[PDB]
Structure 1
Amino acid sequence: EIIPVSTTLELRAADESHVPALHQLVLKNKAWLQQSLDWPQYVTSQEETRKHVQGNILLHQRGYAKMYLIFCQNEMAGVLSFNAIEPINKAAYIGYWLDESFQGQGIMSQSLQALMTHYARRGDIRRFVIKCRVDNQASNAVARRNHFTLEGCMKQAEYLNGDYHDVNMYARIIDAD
């Protein structure tokens, strides 16, 4: 399962074969990922990433979540995913991160747009949501460029780096009729 993004980019569904490369990518970025994600601190050994992946693959096959790996000229560059899918509401919560050396190239912006369009077209997701610290300006720029509307500010909603942070909730509705 591959969702095309561009002549140099593609989304591949999470595989057990990706575990090794992804573990290294996580290691290389966890110091800075920790400021806006919670799970990187619990990742130490490859076994823990494999665990996260096998679990994700299941929710992925059942349609309860999705995990895609972003590939740039056959090189793993980051992860784009639906952390949770509420089938009855056709709503999904988005999560993503990019290896620091693949940033600043519009890679995530384009991947998100290709991913959303694909699901709005299939029709099982029409409402997309992005929740992230209010102060993560890079993620906010990805959401706005993808036409997300800020719905609210959740006060001190997430505990990250020994402190509570206000979280913005961005959403976009796409009815691909």
Structure 2
Amino acid sequence: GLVPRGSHMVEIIPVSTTLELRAADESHVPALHQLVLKNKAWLQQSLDWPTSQEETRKHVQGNILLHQRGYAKMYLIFCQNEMAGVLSFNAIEPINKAAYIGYWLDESFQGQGIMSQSLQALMTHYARRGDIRRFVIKCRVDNQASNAVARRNHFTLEGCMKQAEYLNGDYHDVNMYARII
């Protein structure tokens, strides 16, 4: 069910008249790399993004493999045809019909409700298919924006994982939210 977006035949999940998710493709690496440079300062404070463009290319290629194999998913949020952020399943547990969600949005597109609409469209898409029923978000207790997205979208705080993630020199507590659909 691919669909044309330039010479490129993409997998898309509709979101609204102006928003849609497109599966990351190699063609997205240059623009995605630039988006990452622009927001690098705060992305580095989060678990949502691991230097050069070749490094980005590597990351994208690895995720495309996982995406195609159903081990995870990597979608790019496009707003009116312009790349605005990333939304993914960091991991999928097919037997448990469970998935962990990761996400981030370029600073310029923030505050328009884009992430919630994108998130909602992603979960509805996989939940209708009956493929995923348990959606999980794990984020630093101290990442205000990531926690807000979870709280805006019917996720229940299941517990706080003590010093669960190593980032920039320290171990950080991380909240675990879930929603069953």
TM-score range, shorter chain: over 0.9
Structure 1 unaligned runs (5+)?
none
Moved more, 64-73 or 156-165: 156-165
Give the drift of 1:155: 0.8
- Going from structure 1 to structure 2, the CA distance change for 1:39 and 1:9 (only over 3 Å counts) comes to closer
Residues in 2 aligned to 1:6 and 1:66: alpha-carbon distance in whole angstroms: 20
Give the drift of 1:162: 2.1
Give the drift of 1:172: 0.5
One of 136, 156, 160 as aligned partner of 2:167: 160
Residues in 1 aligned to 2:174 and 2:119: alpha-carbon distance in whole angstroms: 20
- 2:116·2:149 contact (CA, 8 Å) conserved in 1? yes
Give the drift of 1:156: 1.2
Residues in 2 aligned to 1:111 and 1:86: alpha-carbon distance in whole angstroms: 21
Match of 1:170 in 2: 177
Residues in 2 aligned to 1:124 and 1:59: alpha-carbon distance in whole angstroms: 16
Residues in 1 aligned to 2:126 and 2:91: alpha-carbon distance in whole angstroms: 14
- 2:98·2:136 contact (CA, 8 Å) conserved in 1? yes
CA RMSD after TM alignment: 1.1
Give the drift of 1:145: 1.4
How many matched pairs? 171
Give the drift of 1:136: 1.4
Give the drift of 1:9: 0.6
Give the drift of 1:37: 2.4
Give the drift of 1:54: 1.0
One of 2, 5, 9 as aligned partner of 2:12: 2
1:23 aligns with 2:33: yes
Match of 2:154 in 1: 147
Q: Percent identity?
A: 100
- 1:38·1:160 contact (CA, 8 Å) conserved in 2? no
Give the drift of 1:38: 6.7
- Going from structure 1 to structure 2, the CA distance change for 1:38 and 1:3 (only over 3 Å counts) comes to closer
Structure 2 unaligned runs (5+)?
1-10
- Provide, for residues 127-173 of structure 1, a one-character-per-residue CA deviation record: whole Å limited to 9, x for no partner: 00000011212111111211000000011111223222110000001
Task: Provide the TM-score with structure 1 as the length reference.
Answer: 0.93
Task: Provide the TM-score with structure 2 as the length reference.
Answer: 0.91
Matches within 5 A, 1:8-157: 8-37=18-47, 39-40=49-50, 44-157=51-164
Moved more, 65-74 or 155-164: 155-164
Give the drift of 1:88: 1.0
Runs of 4+ in 1 over 2 A off after TM superposition: 37-40
Give the drift of 1:12: 0.3
Residues in 1 aligned to 2:20 and 2:134: alpha-carbon distance in whole angstroms: 23
Residues in 2 aligned to 1:156 and 1:54: alpha-carbon distance in whole angstroms: 30
- Provide, for residues 85-119 of structure 1, a one-character-per-residue CA deviation record: whole Å limited to 9, x for no partner: 01111110100011111111111011000100000
